[PDB]
Design a protein around this ligand. Structure first.
Ligand SMILES: CCCCCCCCCCCCCCCC(=O)O
Ligand SMILES: CCCCCCCCCCCCCCCC(=O)O
Ligand SMILES: CCCCCCCCCCCCCCCC(=O)O
Lengths: 345, 346, 346
């Protein structure tokens, strides 16, 4: 609704934060640091940008105490914080732009709930959502339009599920979980026995999917259920869009899987891992904790020790960095085998 | 059986196109030029050398004025146009297979429409679709069965939204846009802050997504919203299936993204660009106008000049072509040290 | 969930046992962490090391494999069938499938008067069956799914929730389709003005899914401009897969998650396409060809065998290539020091 302006000083008092420069500077929105004019509050997160600070027009830059110590002399208007400058920036963001809901509060009449399903306090089920037999929908839970909550599936308190998500049977979603539109949770794992005449016999997958607390699942991401055990995404992990997660995959706590990456069956990913965009990881292997996998990686063996890895096959960062450099240098190496065929003897 | 027969001349008059050949020739279907028979209507590509034309045994051949000039002397039945042969072929095709909707005209009773939302005239909203608060659906739109138009979002006139599409809140769709089944427009960016030794906190994404006119978005493709700025697909760009558009990516006009490709956050892609299938582009870069990236390209840095690119990391095409070759020639280069090490006399 | 003894299990399975047939067992579990109460099996090799020291109450094992471990004092169940299959027979003794609790045709189903629905068929809340569709007997139509105009579903097929089937698609007998899939979206074909502009062409071809095909979650299959796209019988397709327009997938082929096949390409019978592999348009893949994950096929393949890499090359050749690439620092040695006989200046 708004088109609000506030004074630098007003913003500071709001943010409960120290400031230097004109208290009366007028600020009408937020903007990233390179683009920002005198109308905008902005931030610098960590040194990545730097060059963009002394030239910036920003009428206010949100800064940390160390960065203020580092940039003290520059003639800018600062808001000095001890929290993440990006996280203080978010507070400003939320001043100018407020979230918006669908405008269908509580349980819409068109929402179908099976008699055996248990509905908790303060829940919101949107038009045309379907809750199946013996499902548990938690307290303060949001279920979006045309979403499905399958048989025996449970959705822990404060979870938010966007429009057209499919939560198959026997899936348990933890607390404070966010699922973007299109996500499929609990699809059949891709398991066959090929007969001698080359015909593929389906193996009925009767496992579960466990998605733990504070996990996020992206748009149109598909997580398959295990054959008999469980596919698991552990507490705090964040999964981007269009991601494959095959039967009996386990993802650790506080891990990140970027868009369009895929992980084959019975692979375990450790805690605090990053899987880069469009990466691929085979079945029946492990990734150790604190591993970062670059974008477009093909990982063919377990990665046993922490560090950065890239390429396909995946090799440690230094080894692949060298490999690329040497491949670019083949023309210059043939030139050296050339000069050598200058031999008279 | 064929629902229809026409004479060359009858069809010429239907198409509003000149003809050259035998006006009485009978025509009862369409086929591609290398498979067409006497009863068939076909078109001349734009490629396809003279040999394709000559040995074609087809009742009629849709051709352009320029091409005709070059092939005046050939005894074929020609349907000569100043438009694109294919576009004209299209109309011919539509005489043998007629397009079919779902059979639910106008606004279905089961559609749910928030009182605060404004639905223009002549709109088709199919069964079980939801239109949220302060949404605006323009005149002559189609909202597919079960699709969702989010809070405050706008759809321009003559847009076709197929079934089970999610348009999230604050999304702007222009005129004549087509969105395939299952697409997701305005999901949240993948943007987090890291605290407590690598725990990831959610950052509310409150920017919009802007889709300009004549843009097409393929099936199950996902287009995230910016953090505060906007994700933008410009005029006339066409996006395939299973594509990822990351937070606040800007795509130029008349650019093409092929299936399964992905652009990471905050990247600019200029006009007349083509991103081949299953490609990846990192965040915070630029692709100049008129760039073509081959399938499975992995782009790591900006591209500032036009032309074809491939490989991962992406290099100009000339480059990865020599590379593949020198790599392939590795044994034959090692064989040359199996000989240039025998000469080690004294 | 109950308990059985080895002997009872052997007799149920019609399979021979070795070890003590009094051993009580009550569940299943992967080969490593199987206790005396768990049944397990061995059907690859990468977990074979876990056998010597595994504690399973029962190990289902092939006649061939049994030779290598029959000396160990583990309880074995020995079969000449698929160990995995025999294992499945056990699995189903402890866990049972669950339906949604909505039998037959839910009153919210919206069915067009001109559609035909056979006997003994389930249609779950808010499904939408459009004009001139036919749904065979013993079919399951999952919640919020769409069956488009003139589309048919063969008997005993299972459509999971939120599946979209567009116009003129024919699903064969006993097919499974996972949530989110999209069958019969528009092919990615445009007429490109010389000027750069891209013009839409309604795709009107039919799409055919033959009996026993399985299609994965969120997989998208496009229809041809006017000619047909076919998935021949028995083929299994995984999640997030792109099948572009006019593709023929031969019979009993496997396509793994996130693969993509480009336009009007023909895949043989008994073909395996690995995860994230890509195949260009207008080419051919011979019978019994196996692509590895992340393969990039750029040319037709005609000889059966294992293929990998990008561009695709036969197994032993890409192996050797990776090998010679890794070797490059070592090969530079034999060069650096080969050059350092400019000491032959004397
Ligand atoms: C230095 C050599 C590394 C090997 C080259 C491949 C990956 C480089 C890392 C940057 C990202 C690659 C492009 C994919 C981007 C994406 O999908 O989001
Ligand atoms: C880039 C596709 C256009 C066709 C022109 C031929 C260029 C060679 C194909 C690029 C190499 C990658 C092969 C995978 C193809 C795909 O994913 O669709
Ligand atoms: C980009 C490939 C060319 C180079 C040589 C290719 C052989 C090794 C790469 C195989 C990747 C296997 C990773 C599995 C990915 C997945 O499961 O989806």
């Amino acid at each position: 609704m708004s088109q609000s302006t506030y004074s630098l000083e007003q913003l500071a008092d709001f943010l409960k934060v120290e400031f230097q420069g004109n208290g009366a500077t007028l600020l009408s929105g937020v903007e990233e640091i390179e683009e920002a004019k005198t109308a905008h509050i902005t931030f610098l997160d960590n040194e990545k940008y730097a060059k963009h600070l002394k030239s910036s027009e920003a009428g206010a830059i949100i800064i940390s105490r160390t960065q203020f110590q580092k940039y003290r002399d520059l003639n800018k208007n600062f808001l000095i914080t001890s929290e993440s400058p990006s996280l203080v920036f978010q507070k400003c963001l939320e001043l100018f732009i407020t979230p918006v809901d669908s405008g269908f509060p509580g349980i819409h009449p068109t929402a179908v709930i099976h008699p055996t399903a248990i509905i908790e306090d303060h829940v919101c089920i949107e038009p045309y959502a379907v809750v199946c037999q013996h499902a548990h929908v938690g307290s303060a839970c949001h279920i979006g339009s045309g979403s499905v909550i399958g048989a025996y599936s449970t959705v822990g308190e404060h979870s938010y599920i966007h429009p057209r998500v499919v939560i198959r049977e026997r899936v348990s979603i933890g607390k404070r979980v966010i699922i973007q539109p299109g996500a499929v949770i609990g699809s059949c794992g891709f398991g066959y026995v090929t007969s001698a005449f080359g015909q593929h016999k389906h193996l009925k997958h009767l496992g579960k999917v466990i998605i733990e607390d504070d996990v996020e699942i992206g748009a149109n991401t598909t997580i398959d259920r295990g054959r008999f055990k469980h596919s698991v995404v552990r507490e705090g992990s964040k999964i981007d869009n269009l991601v494959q997660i095959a039967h009996q995959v386990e993802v650790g706590q506080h891990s990140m899987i970027v868009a369009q990456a895929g992980i084959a069956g019975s692979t375990k990913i450790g805690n605090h891992v990053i899987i880069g965009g469009q990466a691929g990881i085979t079945g029946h292997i492990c990734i150790a904790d604190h591993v970062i996998m670059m974008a477009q990686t093909g990982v063919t063996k377990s990665i046993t020790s922490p560090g950065i890895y890239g390429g396909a096959p995946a090799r440690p960062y230094q080894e692949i960095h060298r490999q690329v450099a040497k491949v670019r240098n083949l023309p210059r190496l043939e030139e050296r085998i050339a000069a050598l065929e200058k031999l008279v003897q």
